[PDB]
Amino acid sequence: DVYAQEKQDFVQHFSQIVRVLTEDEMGHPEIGDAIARLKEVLEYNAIGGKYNRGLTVVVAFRELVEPRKQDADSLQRAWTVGWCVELLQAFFLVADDIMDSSLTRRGQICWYQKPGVGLDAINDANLLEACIYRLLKLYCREQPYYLNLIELFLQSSYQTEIGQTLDLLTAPQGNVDLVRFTEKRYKSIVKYKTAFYSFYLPIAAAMYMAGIDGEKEHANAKKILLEMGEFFQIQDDYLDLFGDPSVTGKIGTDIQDNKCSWLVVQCLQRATPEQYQILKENYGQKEAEKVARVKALYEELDLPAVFLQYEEDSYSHIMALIEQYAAPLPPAVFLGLARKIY
Amino acid sequence: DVYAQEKQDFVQHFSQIVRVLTEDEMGHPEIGDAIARLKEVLEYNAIGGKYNRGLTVVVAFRELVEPRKQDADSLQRAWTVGWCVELLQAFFLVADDIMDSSLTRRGQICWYQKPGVGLDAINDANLLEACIYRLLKLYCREQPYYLNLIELFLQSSYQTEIGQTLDLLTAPQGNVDLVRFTEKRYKSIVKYKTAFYSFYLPIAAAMYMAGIDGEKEHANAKKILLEMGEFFQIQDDYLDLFGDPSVTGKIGTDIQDNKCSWLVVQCLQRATPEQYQILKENYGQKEAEKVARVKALYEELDLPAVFLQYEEDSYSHIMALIEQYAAPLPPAVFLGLARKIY
Ligand SMILES: CCCCCN(C)CCC(O)(P(=O)(O)O)P(=O)(O)O
Ligand SMILES: CCCCCN(C)CCC(O)(P(=O)(O)O)P(=O)(O)O
Numbered sequence: 001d002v003y004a005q006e007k008q009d010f011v012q013h014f015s016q017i018v019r020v021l022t023e024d025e026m027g028h029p030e031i032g033d034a035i036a037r038l039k040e041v042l043e044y045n046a047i048g049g050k051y052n053r054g055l056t057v058v059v060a061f062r063e064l065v066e067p068r069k070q071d072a073d074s075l076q077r078a079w080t081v082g083w084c085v086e087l088l089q090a091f092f093l094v095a096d097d098i099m100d101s102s103l104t105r106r107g108q109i110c111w112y113q114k115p116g117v118g119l120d121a122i123n124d125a126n127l128l129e130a131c132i133y134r135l136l137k138l139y140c141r142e143q144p145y146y147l148n149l150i151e152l153f154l155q156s157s158y159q160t161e162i163g164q165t166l167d168l169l170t171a172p173q174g175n176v177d178l179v180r181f182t183e184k185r186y187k188s189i190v191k192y193k194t195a196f197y198s199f200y201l202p203i204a205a206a207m208y209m210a211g212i213d214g215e216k217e218h219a220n221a222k223k224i225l226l227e228m229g230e231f232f233q234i235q236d237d238y239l240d241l242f243g244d245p246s247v248t249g250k251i252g253t254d255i256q257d258n259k260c261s262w263l264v265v266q267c268l269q270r271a272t273p274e275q276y277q278i279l280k281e282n283y284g285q286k287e288a289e290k291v292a293r294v295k296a297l298y299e300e301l302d303l304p305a306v307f308l309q310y311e312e313d314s315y316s317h318i319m320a321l322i323e324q325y326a327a328p329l330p331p332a333v334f335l336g337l338a339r340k341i342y
Numbered sequence: 343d344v345y346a347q348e349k350q351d352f353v354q355h356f357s358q359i360v361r362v363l364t365e366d367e368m369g370h371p372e373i374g375d376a377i378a379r380l381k382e383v384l385e386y387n388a389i390g391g392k393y394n395r396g397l398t399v400v401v402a403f404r405e406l407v408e409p410r411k412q413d414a415d416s417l418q419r420a421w422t423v424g425w426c427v428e429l430l431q432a433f434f435l436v437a438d439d440i441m442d443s444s445l446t447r448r449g450q451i452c453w454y455q456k457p458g459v460g461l462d463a464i465n466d467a468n469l470l471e472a473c474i475y476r477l478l479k480l481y482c483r484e485q486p487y488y489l490n491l492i493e494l495f496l497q498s499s500y501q502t503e504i505g506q507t508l509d510l511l512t513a514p515q516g517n518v519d520l521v522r523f524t525e526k527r528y529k530s531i532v533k534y535k536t537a538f539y540s541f542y543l544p545i546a547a548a549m550y551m552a553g554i555d556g557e558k559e560h561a562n563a564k565k566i567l568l569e570m571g572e573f574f575q576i577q578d579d580y581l582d583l584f585g586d587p588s589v590t591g592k593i594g595t596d597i598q599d600n601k602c603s604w605l606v607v608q609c610l611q612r613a614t615p616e617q618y619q620i621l622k623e624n625y626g627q628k629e630a631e632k633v634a635r636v637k638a639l640y641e642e643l644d645l646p647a648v649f650l651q652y653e654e655d656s657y658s659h660i661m662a663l664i665e666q667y668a669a670p671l672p673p674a675v676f677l678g679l680a681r682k683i684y
């Protein structure tokens with residue numbers, strides 16, 4: 001709701017993001033072709049998603065900053081930082097799609113799968129990352145929270161990349177990796193690869209912009225936000241297999257990629273030795289029939305109903321955490337986020 | 343000389359770099375496997391080079407900072423920042439080797455070509471980049487030049503990535519791209535992809551650490567250092583084809599990769615229409631015989647003698663620039679660098 005009534009404005013501001021990321025270099029004609037390639041990268045890879053992470057910066061900013069301090073310049077900085085979180089996401093997704101050998105993203109073919117792009121996409125991804133710090137300098141250099149924001153984005157990237165490392169290490173291609181797929185391992189992976197940048201980062205950014213920099217307030221916010229992030233990634237795992245492709249915008253690869261997904265972890269906890277064997281001989285391979293066998297096993301073990309029940313229990317757990325840890329922040333900050341993902 | 347007598351110490355300090363980049367996370371057991379993977383990444387990809395860029399930080403620091411201010415802690419910060427430049431290099435090289443489809447680097451098989459690594463190397467590369475800002479925070483957070491260093495590394499990365507973008511855009515695979523290969527295009531590519539991070543960055547870092555932050559002193563240093571960087575990349579292009587593989591540590595790919603190298607640019611300037619045609623039908627392709635035909639054409643046009651002459655003329659030009667622009671810095675700062683690359 002509050003996201004919906006910030007959204008269209010948020011998106012309209014992308015043109016200014018792209019203009020400033022192109023004009024700040026108009027003094028250097030020789031890099032014109034690169035700046036043009038950057039524009040094409042931005043428009044293909046930063047547009048077409050739900051923009052939830054960026055909108056969260058904007059929404060939380062409005063709720064944390066006194067209305068009389070919400071001048072036009074402060075608002076502009078708010079939705080610039082929001083777009084920075086979107087650019088970080090864009091960076092991650094371009095690189096992750098190569099590494100997961102994915103086909104489609106946000107309803108179109110993955111950037112790297114586009115003819116003429118290929119592994120040049122690696123440099124495109126790093127360029128998207130670079131844009132973050134260009135925008136922070138351009139818009140936030142003279143603000144008291146400047147360094148707090150730089151370090152938050154840098155730290156969030158490190159954490160996410162540690163998470164990606166765990167994701168990859170736990171899913172070696174061509175191996176049978178079932179004994180590695182535990183609940184304890186899973187919770188660690190998603191905490192790092194998803195939870196910090198998708199939930200802590202956006203709220204923390206708005207917090208620092210509102211002058212809320214205390215270690216205690218950030219630790220309490222984090223308690224709520226990392227648990228939301230854990231649920232969100234479990235949801236991502238569920239939809240990878242059981243989601244509507246016209247809604248998700250992308251084709252799942254978790255089974256073919258031998259991933260430690262919530263689904264396989266739950267499967268393992270429930271499987272008979274006979275089902276375990278079936279899982280063992282069909283998981284982590286590219287053959288459609290082997291993947292289909294896995295999905296059949298998940299359905300036989302009623303993992304969809306297990307998920308639906310987990311979703312409700314998680315929601316209740318998250319709301320309990322908000323009762324405990326939200327103060328002194330407006331509870332609406334976390335409630336609006338929860339409403340978005342549940 | 344001054345590099346040689348700083349070197350072994352510089353290298354010995356790598357163990358402390360690796361220890362601190364592993365222990366700063368010992369409070370988080372769950373990411374142990376990732377930290378182990380990080381260690382393996384560091385040891386494979388940050389070791390085995392000449393360390394010229396890192397040593398330059400250390401050497402320039404000793405020459406710019408008054409001896410009485412060179413305490414043990416300041417020295418330690420100096421060779422930490424030196425290793426940061428080495429980590430940036432490591433980041434770039436891992437990614438560049440994937441994008442150039444290279445086989446060997448520093449005398450061993452490229453990281454991504456190592457069995458079991460593959461495109462996971464993309465995340466490894468970004469992890470190396472992340473380590474830079476972890477070390478700066480760990481060692482330099484309370485220093486007055488902290489933000490200057492963060493912004494210098496971030497800006498240098500952006501510039502290098504713009505350069506990489508130009509490098510890639512000018513070398514589309516499967517196309518004949520000769521008309522794109524001009525001197526003007528070439529100078530732009532190497533200014534951005536090589537010159538800023540390999541020469542300006544290390545000296546600028548030492549400068550900020552010495553308290554030299556004036557725009558004018560940095561602009562004058564840059565005048566010398568970007569020209570050195572241009573020569574250095576021309577040298578890199580020459581050695582890609584004409585260097586001794588047991589000395590370079592790597593196999594060239596510029597011709598197969600259809601690159602705008604100094605060599606092809608010089609070839610084009612000198613070729614008859616008949617030689618142009620030969621270049622056109624053999625450049626940018628993977629067949630050994632076609633590559634060999636190109637190298638034969640270069641040798642027929644005596645590009646090796648052209649290079650040797652250019653190297654001498656460039657040296658003289660660089661020394662002239664040092665006479666003009668070195669003050670108020672010790673000329674030895676730039677002379678030691680020049681001696682390293684010429
Ligand atoms: C490069 C860092 C990637 C961080 C991974 N994120 C969770 C987003 C990518 C995914 O969620 P996605 O389902 O591919 O969108 P994955 O399930 O592969 O983790
Ligand atoms: C990812 C950014 C790469 C920057 C490129 N640098 C010049 C180092 C790589 C090279 O010098 P290298 O010869 O492969 O070591 P390239 O000739 O491909 O440019």
Ligand SMILES: [Zn+2]
Pocket residue numbers: 096097100102
């Ligand atoms: Zn993915």
Ligand SMILES: [Zn+2]
Pocket residue numbers: 096100167
């Ligand atoms: Zn992934």
Ligand SMILES: [Zn+2]
Pocket residue numbers: 236237240
């Ligand atoms: Zn997923």
Ligand SMILES: [Zn+2]
Pocket residue numbers: 438439442444
């Ligand atoms: Zn290369």
Ligand SMILES: [Zn+2]
Pocket residue numbers: 438442509
């Ligand atoms: Zn290259």
Ligand SMILES: [Zn+2]
Pocket residue numbers: 578579582
């Ligand atoms: Zn080269």
